[PDB]
């Protein structure tokens with residue numbers, strides 16, 4: 001199988017950081033050859049599960065989410081969508097490519113938006129436990145208020161990954177809106193932190209995502225019993241987890257963007273997965 005030779009003295013991306021200081025790749029266009037990666041993942045018959053919550057009104061976001069995932073997400077690989085919803089009948093029946101399936105998991109609806117967002121960790125954890133284990137190799141956990149606009153593939157796959165929050169990738173850490181109160185399990189001292197990861201897109205092997213979600217859930221319970229809610233809820237706890245358990249890949253903001261709020265800067269060669277306007 002024949003492709004351009006990587007040249008040691010002529011890096012493709014010179015404008016951005018492409019590896020973290022613990023040697024995890026930062027995934028940007030021009031750092032990867034998808035043909036090589038597709039072959040590596042196909043030879044293992046990799047199955048990717050994608051979890052998405054659509055509780056109450058967010059069922060309205062599923063049709064575009066799913067149609068655009070069919071176009072752009074892991075195309076050519078085996079995919080299992082897990083749609084968590086309080087309204088199984090409102091899931092649109094989208095036609096899927098071969099080797100792709102969708103399961104609907106009915107769950108309860110929490111009243112507050114915070115708890116719906118926060119209780120995802122518990123629900124991914126869940127107990128949807130020996131089920132994710134037998135069914136898929138990797139789990140990808142995303143917001144439903146989104147659409148795919150370009151390739152999201154096996155380049156993201158790794159034991160544990162997070163995604164750079166699009167409104168903080170160019171900032172310094174004291175500007176990061178981590179939880180700064182030490183009463184919270186989510187507390188990160190002001191002199192600490194690598195990146196600000198966004199809550200809408202994380203994943204990894206099933207064992208690592210279960211660890212993560214179990215820890216974030218146990219940490220959120222400790223805070224509740226202590227009468228505190230972290231400033232950005234699950235995102236706060238995700239950031240704390242990924243500080244202490246560093247991801248083995250970091251996705252660039254190509255993988256989580258909002259063209260309406262942020263435009264299309266030159267540093268972004270593709271906008272792959274983006275926010276859909278809402279109230």
Ligand SMILES: O=c1ccn([C@@H]2O[C@H](COP(=O)(O)OP(=O)(O)O)[C@@H](O)[C@H]2O)c(=O)[nH]1
Nearest residue numbers: 052053054055056058113116117143144145
């Ligand atoms: O009433 C709700 C509130 C939240 N969510 C889920 O939790 C995610 C996070 O909430 P949201 O996207 O509202 O937060 P934002 O990204 O706007 O900060 C959503 O994408 C949905 O998957 C849901 O299904 N129904």
Ligand SMILES: OC[C@H]1O[C@@H](O)[C@H](O)[C@@H](O)[C@H]1O
Nearest residue numbers: 165167176177198199232235
């Ligand atoms: O600072 C953290 C916050 O930043 C905002 O831009 C975003 O809308 C929130 O969802 C949260 O991520």
Ligand SMILES: OC[C@H]1O[C@@H](O)[C@H](O)[C@@H](O)[C@H]1O
Nearest residue numbers: 117143199200232233234235
């Ligand atoms: O406020 C908490 C929320 O933060 C948003 O930025 C993120 O997209 C959501 O997944 C949720 O974590």
Ligand SMILES: [Mn+2]
Nearest residue numbers: 143144145200
């Ligand atoms: Mn969202």
